[PDB]
Design a protein around this ligand. Structure first.
Ligand SMILES: *[C@@H]1O[C@H](CO)[C@@H](O[C@@H]2O[C@H](CO)[C@@H](O[C@@H]3O[C@H](CO)[C@@H](O)[C@H](O)[C@@H]3O)[C@H](O)[C@H]2NC(C)=O)[C@H](O)[C@H]1NC(C)=O
Ligand SMILES: *[C@@H]1O[C@H](CO)[C@@H](O[C@@H]2O[C@H](CO)[C@@H](O)[C@H](O)[C@H]2NC(C)=O)[C@H](O)[C@H]1NC(C)=O
Ligand SMILES: *[C@@H]1O[C@H](CO)[C@@H](O[C@@H]2O[C@H](CO)[C@@H](O)[C@H](O)[C@H]2NC(C)=O)[C@H](O)[C@H]1NC(C)=O
Ligand SMILES: *[C@@H]1O[C@H](CO)[C@@H](O)[C@H](O)[C@H]1NC(C)=O
Ligand SMILES: *[C@@H]1O[C@H](CO)[C@@H](O)[C@H](O)[C@H]1NC(C)=O
Ligand SMILES: *[C@@H]1O[C@H](CO)[C@@H](O)[C@H](O)[C@H]1NC(C)=O
Ligand SMILES: *[C@@H]1O[C@H](CO)[C@@H](O)[C@H](O)[C@H]1NC(C)=O
Ligand SMILES: *[C@@H]1O[C@H](CO)[C@@H](O)[C@H](O)[C@H]1NC(C)=O
Ligand SMILES: *[C@@H]1O[C@H](CO)[C@@H](O)[C@H](O)[C@H]1NC(C)=O
Ligand SMILES: *[C@@H]1O[C@H](CO)[C@@H](O)[C@H](O)[C@H]1NC(C)=O
Ligand SMILES: *[C@@H]1O[C@H](CO)[C@@H](O)[C@H](O)[C@H]1NC(C)=O
Ligand SMILES: *[C@@H]1O[C@H](CO)[C@@H](O)[C@H](O)[C@H]1NC(C)=O
Ligand SMILES: *[C@@H]1O[C@H](CO)[C@@H](O)[C@H](O)[C@H]1NC(C)=O
Ligand SMILES: *[C@@H]1O[C@H](CO)[C@@H](O)[C@H](O)[C@H]1NC(C)=O
Ligand SMILES: *[C@@H]1O[C@H](CO)[C@@H](O)[C@H](O)[C@H]1NC(C)=O
Ligand SMILES: *[C@@H]1O[C@H](CO)[C@@H](O)[C@H](O)[C@H]1NC(C)=O
Ligand SMILES: *[C@@H]1O[C@H](CO)[C@@H](O)[C@H](O)[C@H]1NC(C)=O
Ligand SMILES: *[C@@H]1O[C@H](CO)[C@@H](O)[C@H](O)[C@H]1NC(C)=O
Ligand SMILES: *[C@@H]1O[C@H](CO)[C@@H](O)[C@H](O)[C@H]1NC(C)=O
Ligand SMILES: *[C@@H]1O[C@H](CO)[C@@H](O)[C@H](O)[C@H]1NC(C)=O
Ligand SMILES: *[C@@H]1O[C@H](CO)[C@@H](O)[C@H](O)[C@H]1NC(C)=O
Ligand SMILES: *[C@@H]1O[C@H](CO)[C@@H](O)[C@H](O)[C@H]1NC(C)=O
Ligand SMILES: *[C@@H]1O[C@H](CO)[C@@H](O)[C@H](O)[C@H]1NC(C)=O
Ligand SMILES: *[C@@H]1O[C@H](CO)[C@@H](O)[C@H](O)[C@H]1NC(C)=O
Ligand SMILES: *[C@@H]1O[C@H](CO)[C@@H](O)[C@H](O)[C@H]1NC(C)=O
Ligand SMILES: *[C@@H]1O[C@H](CO)[C@@H](O)[C@H](O)[C@H]1NC(C)=O
Ligand SMILES: *[C@@H]1O[C@H](CO)[C@@H](O)[C@H](O)[C@H]1NC(C)=O
Lengths: 124, 421, 121, 121, 118
């Protein structure tokens, strides 16, 4: 019903940095929280990060708290994920998604709803 | 949904309330989108407060003034010896009395011109008249060099309260108002005191508004707010020479000394064509409540005393009582004679009399007519409307009809998915 | 941005972002003095009522009193997105005192529990 | 539910459950304005004094001031279970200014310690 | 203790330790009493709009702009007095207060969301 388009990056060496982004269309971006979810090529889904609708609150898994930064721009309808100190274990398809937490005055969700088309991160 | 009570402070809500407003003078306004507010100008406590404030300020202004105790004597009144027009014969008398002076034992003979309406005959052998109010109350002279001109006054809400203003066009004083705004102070309202005609005030923006409570009840006054002002020229064409005497230590009395030239009647000039069009506008906006085929008649203000049967107003500092017989005589230039009165009992009080000192020269006022106070006869195919007034709340309801005072209730609760711990 | 009461006709979710605008306008011869004393008393009564709920110094104060479905059987997508604070204030004119009593009792229990936990070595 | 001061003759441990009943009755021509202004001034002096101690917004405020056995040598089983607040006030009134000074100094030291703790990067 | 305003001529880092002496003299003819109460309540309201409700020393999340004052802390707190400092930043005080209000508003919503997580 809505369109989410990710922009990925190329091949990065261990210890380098890589920026992913996601553009939203077809709904009010500022009304929903957004998240990034990781999927290794041979494994299942793993949640990595969650940001609220205003961009003020960010949550991460312990393994990325000192490495990944999630940022939101409600005027450009743009998400970004800046990853530092990448390792070969971080090679995966990353998806941006609409869902997760709701901002206290909205009905409770705690689920992912709309998904993008994926972006590949390859680490040497 | 496992909802919890969350307390919010600073909630933009209000409740109807009656509080004390404070006054301001010249030594914001926020439009409320999607806000519909119910107004009722007939239950608006701003009118009662304005009434009490104007009476209180009036009493405070007149209190520290000359009490004119020496004037309750016997007056030797004779006919004025000047050239008097046909309609002024007997309306002005040349009255001689023995007035006191600074020294308690010395008295001076003083000649002054009193209007017939200010004196009452009596049957003493040596004196003919007395002042009308000496059997009822003491007569306080208004302090000289004090103006009675209405000065725009702003009513301002206390902190925690706000005034809502109705911006709707063709607003009839009651019911929902969709275009509203929040103000802290009202516009500048002139405390004009008059009967039958509203002279200086807010003018309607689109059409003549017929504004009344229970319009089917003929006992209620109908306030007509015009969208065009009719210009009325008020003149007292008598070149009045004013004299002054002292009647005690620190006291002074002012009186009419003479009239230079011929004595003529005071007049008001209302344009015939403009008033005829104004009445046509009132009738077109009045048939809506009585029927398109109902005959609407205007008749004079029969019944009551001079204060309510004539158009009373303060022009210059003289109180005019104009016979509006030529403005309200019709079935659907006008010169109105006016009587001038100096012993004034304002509002509905009996025991509080004021003496208006005369003003040197010729008084001319140019005033608007922005609205009317009409009443309707009781009891088929015709209706009779007459000038009304004298209550003096209508003169201020016609300005405060668009304002309401509300109390702000900043505290409230609402469900949220938010648990404190 | 909209000024005092400018959000009164907006939805309560949008009007909740103007709480400081409303709060700043609550504080600012015998009639002037009586009006000022009355404004101070209304402000202090509201501040005391917040204080006894554990909400002192806050404009948005979450509590631990559950919402009873009998007070208003509406979802948050309707209360916060399609309703104004004026309509809500009219809707819960009834039950406001019940909510206030429950908030006072909950804060008394919370103060006793905090006193017992802080006194626990 | 005993009413205003209904717990005045109850023990301190039982009377401490009615703090909101007494608290809510503290706020509610020139003679009456003087009375209202004095009521407001007494309330504000008490609230400022609580704020200085770091007790703002609470009816039961725990502090870091040790109790001096010279102020009162009674144990908790006597003060809270077999004594009323009036008798306690009569016993402690000689020492309440020392206690107030110690509370003010303790809160000033606590504020400096909190500011220094929040200055560690 | 020096007394009321006795630290007015002392440096900011010395006068800041006597805040309770100043605070106790703000509350203690009717027009004067009501005016004093209103000024006290306006100051406490400004503190409550910010997150500084019950505190005399309150740390906020507003960064200091070098355009307001570019002095280092070794001059503001050790050399300068509160009167000179108050004169220096008068022109920006109304800006700073506005930012403080904005910060608290964001904080309140963030806290409301953080307490909304099950
Ligand atoms: C309705 O409004 C009109 C317009 O203001 C009022 O007429 C004005 O009345 C004042 C009364 O003080 C006049 O001021 C006087 O003017 C004379 C001029 O010689 C001066 O000698 C006096 O000392 C005083 O300043 C003012 O001129 C007059 N304006 C016009 C254009 O004539 C009218 O009185 C108001 N109606 C009522 C019922 O109050
Ligand atoms: C109202 O209109 C009448 C016209 O009927 C004015 O009367 C004229 O006044 C001038 C003034 O000197 C005289 O010269 C004319 O002779 C008068 N005409 C008549 C027919 O008597 C009257 O003055 C006007 N009044 C005002 C206040 O404007
Ligand atoms: C002056 O006003 C009166 C009414 O206020 C007008 O009507 C006169 O009223 C008296 C008593 O009610 C009657 O005796 C008169 O016969 C009435 N006059 C007429 C012409 O019928 C009076 O007409 C007004 N004066 C003018 C000059 O119009
Ligand atoms: C009033 O009567 C006295 C009698 O001496 C006279 O001098 C005076 O001119 C008279 N006034 C008028 C207006 O005729
Ligand atoms: C005075 O004027 C009145 C007016 O009607 C008249 O009746 C009366 O006779 C006059 N008096 C004298 C003495 O001319
Ligand atoms: C004063 O005298 C007049 C004479 O007509 C009379 O109408 C009026 O009632 C009297 N007033 C009092 C209070 O006696
Ligand atoms: C409300 O009244 C004002 C008065 O000028 C006008 O400008 C505005 O357009 C009106 N709004 C509506 C919605 O009618
Ligand atoms: C009277 O009406 C005229 C319109 O002809 C207007 O310009 C003037 O300001 C009005 N005066 C008052 C006092 O309402
Ligand atoms: C006043 O209202 C009438 C209604 O018939 C209208 O014809 C006239 O143009 C209006 N005048 C103004 C100035 O709005
Ligand atoms: C005024 O307007 C309200 C709007 O509903 C209407 O009910 C009432 O009858 C009107 N009254 C008059 C006198 O026009
Ligand atoms: C006016 O008042 C009378 C008094 O009985 C009542 O019968 C009538 O219904 C009222 N009309 C309106 C429109 O309020
Ligand atoms: C009235 O008469 C006096 C006498 O000198 C004169 O100065 C004045 O101008 C006259 N006034 C009028 C309005 O005719
Ligand atoms: C008198 O009234 C007429 C109405 O036709 C008006 O044109 C004229 O200007 C008025 N006179 C004055 C002096 O304003
Ligand atoms: C009033 O309602 C309209 C309906 O879309 C909305 O756009 C507007 O923002 C509302 N007004 C306010 C002040 O929120
Ligand atoms: C909600 O209120 C009703 C009142 O009829 C009461 O019976 C019910 O127990 C209340 N619910 C809770 C959870 O307290
Ligand atoms: C909220 O409740 C109303 C009540 O009928 C319902 O129509 C609406 O769909 C509900 N919203 C959600 C998001 O469930
Ligand atoms: C509140 O309760 C009373 C009890 O009779 C009832 O009449 C009134 O309509 C109720 N109000 C609401 C808004 O439910
Ligand atoms: C008064 O004392 C008796 C003694 O047993 C006790 O039971 C009672 O509860 C006391 N009253 C109050 C109000 O505490
Ligand atoms: C408080 O106790 C200490 C010993 O702990 C003692 O030195 C001091 O004098 C006591 N305070 C008073 C006021 O007696
Ligand atoms: C403790 O309290 C009991 C009474 O409950 C008393 O008899 C005893 O002496 C107290 N002990 C102390 C102060 O050490
Ligand atoms: C203390 O305990 C005794 C035990 O008999 C009782 O009589 C007395 O009333 C109690 N005192 C208070 C203040 O409750
Ligand atoms: C408090 O001090 C006064 C001063 O002498 C003394 O008389 C009184 O007994 C003291 N109170 C107590 C409870 O010791
Ligand atoms: C005034 O300046 C001197 C110079 O160092 C300083 O020692 C003294 O403490 C200052 N006074 C105050 C009240 O701080
Ligand atoms: C300081 O203020 C200037 C004023 O325009 C602004 O441009 C700048 O970004 C501000 N810097 C900070 C760090 O707030
Ligand atoms: C602060 O800046 C001044 C510039 O006048 C400089 O002299 C001083 O050394 C600086 N402070 C520190 C601690 O470096
Ligand atoms: C800073 O310290 C120096 C020490 O010499 C002094 O001269 C200067 O006035 C101080 N600055 C201020 C603003 O007082
Ligand atoms: C502050 O404003 C005053 C006048 O308002 C001006 O004289 C002064 O230079 C300004 N200071 C700064 C630092 O902008």
């Amino acid at each position: 019903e809505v369109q989410l388009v990710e922009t990925g990056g190329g091949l990065v060496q261990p210890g380098g940095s890589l920026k992913l982004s996601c553009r939203a269309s077809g709904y009010t971006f500022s009304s929903f929280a957004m998240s990034w979810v990781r999927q290794a090529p041979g494994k299942g889904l793993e949640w990595v990060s969650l940001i609220n609708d205003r961009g003020g609150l960010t949550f991460y898994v312990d393994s990325v708290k000192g490495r990944f930064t999630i940022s939101r721009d409600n005027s450009k309808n743009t998400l970004s994920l800046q990853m530092h100190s990448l390792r070969d274990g971080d090679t995966a398809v990353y998806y941006c998604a609409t869902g997760g937490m709701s901002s206290a005055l909205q009905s409770s969700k705690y689920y992912f709803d709309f998904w993008g088309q994926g972006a590949l991160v390859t680490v040497s | 949904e496992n909802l919890w009570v969350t307390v919010y402070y600073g909630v933009p809500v209000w409740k109807d309330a009656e509080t004390t407003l404070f006054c301001a003078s010249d030594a914001q306004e926020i439009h409320l989108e999607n806000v519909t507010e119910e107004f009722n100008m007939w239950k608006n406590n701003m009118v009662e407060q304005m009434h009490e404030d104007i009476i209180s300020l009036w009493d405070q202004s007149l209190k520290p003034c000359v009490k004119l105790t020496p004037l309750c004597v016997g007056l030797q009144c004779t006919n004025v010896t000047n050239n008097i027009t046909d309609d002024m014969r007997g309306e002005l008398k040349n009255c001689s009395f023995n007035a006191t002076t600074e020294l308690r034992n010395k008295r001076q003979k003083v000649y002054s011109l009193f209007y017939r309406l200010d004196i009452v005959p009596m049957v003493d052998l040596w004196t003919n008249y007395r002042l009308i109010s000496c059997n009822t109350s003491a007569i306080t002279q208004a302090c000289p060099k004090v103006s009675f001109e209405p000065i725009p006054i702003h009513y301002c809400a206390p902190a925690g309260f706000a005034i809502l203003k109705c911006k709707d066009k063709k607003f009839n004083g009651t019911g929902p108002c969709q275009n509203v705004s929040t103000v802290q102070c009202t516009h500048g309202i002139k405390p004009v005191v008059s009967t039958q005609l509203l002279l200086n005030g807010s003018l309607a923006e689109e059409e003549v508004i017929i504004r009344s409570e229970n319009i089917t009840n003929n006992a209620k006054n109908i306030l007509v707010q015009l969208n065009t002002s009719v210009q009325i020229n008020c003149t007292r064409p008598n070149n009045n020479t004013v004299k002054s005497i002292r009647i005690g230590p620190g006291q002074a009395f002012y009186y009419t000394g003479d009239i230079i030239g011929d004595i003529r009647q005071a007049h008001c000039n209302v344009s015939k064509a403009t008033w005829n069009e104004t009445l046509g506008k009132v009738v077109k906006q009045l048939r809506k409540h009585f029927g398109n085929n109902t005959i609407i008649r205007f008749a004079q203000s029969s019944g009551g005393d001079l204060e309510v049967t004539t158009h009373s107003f303060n022009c210059g500092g003289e109180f005019f009582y104009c016979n509006t017989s030529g403005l309200f005589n019709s079935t659907w230039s006008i010169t109105l004679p006016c009587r001038i009165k100096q012993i004034i009992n304002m509002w509905q009080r009996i025991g509080q009399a004021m003496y208006a000192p005369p003003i040197q020269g010729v008084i001319r006022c140019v005033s608007n007519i922005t609205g009317l106070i009409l009443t309707r006869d009781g009891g088929s195919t015709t209706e009779t409307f007459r000038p009304g007034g004298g209550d003096m709340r209508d003169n201020w309801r016609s300005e405060l009809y668009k304002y309401k005072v509300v109390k702000i209730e900043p505290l409230g609760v609402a469900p949220t998915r938010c648990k404190r711990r | 941005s909209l000024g005092f009461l400018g959000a009164a006709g907006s939805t309560m979710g949008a009007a909740s972002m103007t709480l400081t605008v409303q709060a700043r306008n609550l504080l600012s011869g015998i009639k002037q003095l009586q009006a000022r004393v009355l404004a101070v008393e209304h402000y202090l009564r509201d501040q005391q009522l917040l204080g006894i709920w554990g909400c002192s110094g806050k404009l948005i104060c979450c509590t631990n009193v559950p919402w009873n479905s009998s007070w208003s059987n509406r979802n948050l997508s309707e209360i916060w997105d399609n309703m104004t604070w004026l309509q809500w204030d009219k809707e819960i004119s009834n039950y406001t005192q019940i909510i206030y009593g429950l908030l006072e009792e909950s804060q008394n229990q919370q103060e006793k529990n905090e006193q017992d936990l802080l006194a626990l070595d």
